[PDB]
């Protein structure tokens, strides 16, 4: 009874801490730390039986970042549907996150949409790029994107400007909000006190 209850409470604190740690590794480009932290968060999640809404949000953030991190990974599958790309999955989770639908949200959402198509066109998969587009779609540059696919214009001024790094930098900005938003969660706060 009471021991299992303490364990669930502790598991919630570990989830928050591991999210924070995942966010930092993502922000800093520390790829190996990200991998190991992802593995830990997954196990801690896999270990919980029930979830609060607030915990589900934390999990979404983790899922979002892992999908984005796997953006260029050719063999990476995140859905039942084997053809759904990581950036689509990221987009799916991005819509599911309870948050502000503001300036930065749309910029990120649109950059992800653009890059979901762009990765294929640097991979020669003009075929799938359209299927990606099909699955994805209502944005400002919608029309131009569809025709860039048709023209197979991989090196267009468009993809150069709305690049993978542009996408990563906008996402990293959001991550910084998440960082300071839950840097005061229990485990990190206790740990910071000890150290300070």
């Amino acid at each position: 009874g009471l021991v299992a209850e303490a364990e669930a409470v502790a598991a919630g604190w570990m989830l928050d801490f591991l999210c924070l740690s995942l966010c930092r590794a993502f922000r800093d480009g520390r790829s190996e730390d990200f991998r190991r932290t992802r593995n830990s968060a997954e196990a801690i999640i896999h270990g919980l039986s029930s979830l609060t809404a607030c915990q589900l949000r934390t999990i979404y953030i983790c899922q979002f970042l892992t999908r984005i991190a796997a953006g260029k990974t050719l063999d990476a599958q995140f859905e039942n549907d084997e053809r759904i790309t990581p950036l689509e999955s990221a987009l799916m989770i991005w819509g599911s996150i309870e948050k502000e639908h503001d300036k930065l949200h749309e910029e990120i959402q649109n950059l992800i949409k653009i890059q979901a198509i762009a990765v294929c066109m640097e991979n020669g998969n003009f075929k799938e790029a359209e299927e990606v587009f099909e699955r994805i779609f209502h944005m400002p540059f919608k029309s131009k994107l569809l025709m860039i696919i048709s023209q197979k214009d991989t090196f267009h001024s468009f993809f150069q400007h709305f690049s993978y790094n542009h996408m990563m930098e906008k996402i990293k900005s959001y991550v910084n909000y998440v960082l300071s938003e839950k840097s005061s969660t229990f485990l990190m706060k206790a740990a910071a006190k000890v150290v300070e």
């Binding site: 992802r38 593995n39 968060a41 997954e42 999640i45 896999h46 983790c62 899922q63 892992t66 796997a70 990974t73 990476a76 599958q77 995140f78 859905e79 039942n80 990581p86």
Partner: peptide, 6 residues
Amino acid sequence: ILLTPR
């Protein structure tokens, strides 16, 4: 599937 890809 959850955090790690297949």
